[PDB]
C-alpha cells in the first residue's frame, strides 16, 4: 500500500501546461517525515493549493469493519 507522499509526488510528474483545476508549473519537492507523521512540501502557490485540496479529499475516516465467520458442523 503506497503512501500519500509517494502517490502525490508520482502524480505531479511529466506535465507541460498550466491553468489547472480540481475534480471530485514545475517539479514540486514532496517528502515524508514519519517521525512526526508529516509531509514537507516545496512548490508554487497553485501547486501547494492543489496539494492541500487533494490531500484533504484523500484522507478522511477509515471506517471499521468487523467480520464474524460462522463454521457449523
Amino acid at each position: 500500500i503506497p503512501g500519500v507522499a509517494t502517490v502525490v509526488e508520482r502524480l505531479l510528474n511529466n506535465g507541460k501546461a498550466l491553468s489547472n483545476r480540481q475534480a471530485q508549473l514545475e517539479d514540486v519537492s514532496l517528502i515524508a517525515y514519519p517521525e512526526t507523521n508529516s509531509i514537507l512540501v516545496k512548490g508554487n502557490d497553485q501547486q501547494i493549493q492543489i496539494i492541500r485540496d487533494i490531500i484533504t479529499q484523500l484522507d478522511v475516516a477509515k471506517r471499521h469493519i468487523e467480520l464474524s465467520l460462522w463454521i457449523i458442523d
Binding site: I1, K62, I65, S68, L69, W70
Partner: protein, 176 residues
C-alpha cells in the same frame, strides 16, 4: 448411534481496504476412563471494503479443521476434517451469507448367508449376518460482517495501574 454438533466463530476487526490476518489453533483433550487429543486450527485472511448502499464486500481465504488423531475417543472429540475455501463475496448489512458448504450422506447394507438352510422359515434367520451403516454430515461456512459504530466500543473510563503507588514508594524510597 452417534451425534455431534460443533459451532466455531472467529471474529476479527479491521479498517476498510486494509488486509487483516487471524490464525489460531487449540488442542482438545479427553481423559480416558483409566488421554486423546485433537488439534483444531483455523486461519482466515481477509480484505474488506464497502460498496453501494453500505454493502460490505470481502476477499476471503479461509482454512480450518483438525488433524487426524485416531475407545470412543474419536467418538467424543470433534474430528471435523479439514476444509479450505478461497473466494470473494459481498453482503448487505444486516444479513449473512453462506459462502461455502458441503453435505454428505452414506448408506450401506451387507448380508452374508449360508445358501440353502438359511432360507428355512423359523431357524434359518440364525445363519444370516446383516450389517448396516447410515450417516449424514453437514458443514457450513457463513459470514456476517458489520460496521463498527460508537455503540460497539466498551465503556471503561478507568485504568487499573499494574502496581500501587504505595508499593512503589515502599520498594524504592530511602529506608526511614
Amino acid at each position: 448411534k452417534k451425534k455431534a454438533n460443533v459451532v466455531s466463530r472467529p471474529v476479527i476487526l479491521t479498517q476498510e481496504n486494509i488486509p487483516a490476518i487471524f490464525d489460531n489453533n487449540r488442542t482438545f483433550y479427553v481423559s480416558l476412563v483409566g488421554l486423546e487429543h485433537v488439534t483444531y486450527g483455523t486461519l482466515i485472511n481477509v480484505i474488506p471494503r464497502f460498496s453501494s448502499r453500505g454493502q460490505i464486500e470481502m476477499s476471503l481465504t479461509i482454512e480450518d479443521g483438525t488433524g487426524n488423531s485416531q475407545n470412543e475417543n474419536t467418538s467424543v472429540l470433534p474430528e471435523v476434517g479439514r476444509t479450505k475455501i478461497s473466494t470473494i463475496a459481498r453482503v448487505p448489512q444486516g444479513k449473512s451469507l453462506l459462502i461455502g458448504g458441503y453435505t454428505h450422506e452414506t448408506n450401506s447394507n451387507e448380508i452374508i448367508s449360508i445358501p440353502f438352510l438359511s432360507s428355512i422359515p423359523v431357524i434359518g434367520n440364525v445363519f444370516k449376518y446383516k450389517t448396516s451403516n447410515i450417516s449424514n454430515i453437514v458443514r457450513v461456512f457463513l459470514i456476517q460482517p458489520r460496521e463498527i459504530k460508537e455503540s460497539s466500543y466498551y465503556n471503561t473510563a478507568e485504568y487499573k495501574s499494574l502496581i500501587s503507588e504505595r508499593e512503589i514508594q515502599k520498594t524504592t524510597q530511602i529506608i526511614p
